[PDB]
Structure 1
Amino acid sequence: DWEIPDGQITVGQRIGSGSFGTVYKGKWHGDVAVKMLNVTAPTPQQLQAFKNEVGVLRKTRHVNILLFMGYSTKPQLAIVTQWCEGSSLYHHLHIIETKFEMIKLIDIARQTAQGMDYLHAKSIIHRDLKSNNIFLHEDLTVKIGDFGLAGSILWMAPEVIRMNPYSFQSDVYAFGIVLYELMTGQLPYSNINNRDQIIFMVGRGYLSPDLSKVRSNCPKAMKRLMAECLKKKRDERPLFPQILASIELLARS
């Protein structure tokens, strides 16, 4: 069982704080990441969200998924995962501007599609895939998780922006935005400074990511796949088995 024996987890540095909880770098058979709910006594809705999160996490065992390690309920509700080395894909692309070679970019894409295909096969809809939720462990392996504590409308499919509108296809749209980030090094709609206007326009189908911005060395097949994933009509979007087969085919070139 994944219930960690009481008084074994040690929490060190606080590495993230929000309203959905606090994340600390801890110690439990080496470095771990510990997510805790700040309140000493929780709401029955909080206990349920904890149970639901452990229910999803305990179902996952794949190299491209952040490793769930266990949970504690005493003294506080805590979820323990592995401690990664490096930074998020968001950090690489948008903050430290890491210039990865095309072969490496296609690899990050393949590994993300690999983890997304795993989640979808286990009937897990991520609901918040974005480059911040894609960790580049040892600067080599994609680890997908939900690293947040709170939103992020750039990866939101038009029907999610409108109004349950979450599906395998809405995750595919967010994956298309990630491909856009990888192939352009940029976030979409960088020339618009109004949040509400982006929300309104994506939702109405007036605004769409500018594909003319993709790198010169970006394969023709990659540009096609990106456009397919970003289709305003969700039923028109390919699923991850097809996405992965498209990435693996163009990789042999």
Structure 2
Amino acid sequence: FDDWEIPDGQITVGQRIGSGSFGTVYKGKWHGDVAVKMLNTPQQLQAFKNEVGVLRKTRHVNILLFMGYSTKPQLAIVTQWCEGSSLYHHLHASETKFEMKKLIDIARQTARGMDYLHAKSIIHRDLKSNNIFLHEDNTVKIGDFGLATSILWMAPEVIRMSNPYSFQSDVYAFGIVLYELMTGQLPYSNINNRDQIIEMVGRGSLSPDLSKVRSNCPKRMKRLMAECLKKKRDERPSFPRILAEIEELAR
């Protein structure tokens, strides 16, 4: 027995949404709206529990709340549902037009969530607009930090190799998310060959064109952005600075 496990048939799985890290996300109903990631054999089950233990403990207003799991009919992680869907969806699919204030607020909240994770020494490894979610009440919720133990966001040192992930590569990824916020575009949209992008970013010769950012993008945000995207990782700011900087420029 286990408190945190949801019994078979207690969850109604609804519309398939897409595939995030390690699995497939569905809309679902567990005493309310929820999101369900179907994950992709004992021993493995115990390792899964050890992860559930860790997940149960990382709680912040700006990251998804872990609500429970299933084992049958399949491995599943259940979190709260975000009606606003993802940032990626709003920018590059439905092309929603956010006010600069909403964009800077989204950037602030994502930075708070990242600040929380990093202060807990957790490395995300996959920050991108696809798993930055918008909740009905207008707060940002980050996902895909779980199961700790897409190339467009990999810092140059991450691209060319080998568990290369670090705090500073997270900061880079966030830098790309600022690019998306401030340009409404994915970086490198004019290059079609993902293999040429990998190589060129990996060598440090390719990087986002910060001149494509909207006119009303404040000067400090552009400054911050360029810092986070700095090729030499130890030259990138930490998230307490990043959060501090965005808090202030919003004022």
Q: For the Cα contact (< 8 Å) 1:19–1:150, is it kept in 2?
A: no
Q: Which moved more, 1:148-157 or 1:81-90?
A: 148-157
Distance 1:46 1:94, change over 3 A: farther
User: Structure 1 CA distance, aligned partners of 2:212 and 2:20?
Assistant: 34
| C-alpha RMSD of matched pairs (Å) | 2.8
Provide the secondary structure at the position in 1 that maps to 2:216. Answer: coil
Distance 1:57 1:147, change over 3 A: closer
Given the alignment, which residue of 86, 89, 92 partners 1:91? 89
TM-score, normalised relative to structure 2: 0.89
Post-superposition Cα deviations, 1:166-208, rounded to whole Å, max 9, x if no partner, equal 1111100000000000011101111111101100010100001
User: Structure 1 CA distance, aligned partners of 2:77 and 2:172?
Assistant: 28
Q: For the Cα contact (< 8 Å) 2:24–2:38, is it kept in 1?
A: yes
Provide the secondary structure at the position in 2 that maps to 1:143. Answer: strand
Q: Which moved more, 1:188-197 or 1:1-10?
A: 1-10
User: Structure 1 CA distance, aligned partners of 2:176 and 2:47?
Assistant: 28
Q: 4+ residue stretches of structure 1 with deviation over 6 A?
A: 147-151
By how many angstroms is 1:148 displaced? 11
Distance 1:48 1:127, change over 3 A: farther
Q: For the Cα contact (< 8 Å) 1:205–1:232, is it kept in 2?
A: yes
Distance 1:110 1:133, change over 3 A: same
By how many angstroms is 1:145 displaced? 0.1
Distance 1:196 1:177, change over 3 A: same
- Report the counterpart of residue 19 of structure 2 in structure 1: 17
By how many angstroms is 1:87 displaced? 2.0
User: Structure 2 CA distance, aligned partners of 1:78 and 1:148?
Assistant: 12
Q: Which moved more, 1:200-209 or 1:210-219?
A: 210-219
Q: For the Cα contact (< 8 Å) 1:50–1:77, is it kept in 2?
A: no
User: Structure 1 CA distance, aligned partners of 2:183 and 2:149?
Assistant: 23
Distance 1:17 1:88, change over 3 A: closer
Distance 1:18 1:186, change over 3 A: closer
Q: Which moved more, 1:202-211 or 1:83-92?
A: 83-92
Distance 1:159 1:55, change over 3 A: farther
Distance 1:147 1:84, change over 3 A: farther
Q: Is 2:215 aligned against 1:232?
A: no
Q: Which moved more, 1:190-199 or 1:50-59?
A: 50-59
Question: How many residue pairs are counted as aligned between the two chains?
Answer: 248
Post-superposition Cα deviations, 1:34-79, rounded to whole Å, max 9, x if no partner, equal 22236xxxx5785477346424421222121112101122343221
Q: For the Cα contact (< 8 Å) 2:123–2:145, is it kept in 1?
A: no
Distance 1:32 1:188, change over 3 A: same
Give ranges in structure 2 of 5+ residues lacking alignment: none
Provide the secondary structure at the position in 2 that maps to 1:16. Answer: strand
By how many angstroms is 1:3 displaced? 2.6
By how many angstroms is 1:88 displaced? 0.9
Post-superposition Cα deviations, 1:79-125, rounded to whole Å, max 9, x if no partner, equal 11111112211111111221211111110100000000011112211
By how many angstroms is 1:22 displaced? 3.2
By how many angstroms is 1:133 displaced? 0.8
User: Structure 1 CA distance, aligned partners of 2:221 and 2:75?
Assistant: 43
User: Structure 2 CA distance, aligned partners of 1:128 and 1:151?
Assistant: 13
Distance 1:217 1:196, change over 3 A: same
Distance 1:139 1:19, change over 3 A: closer
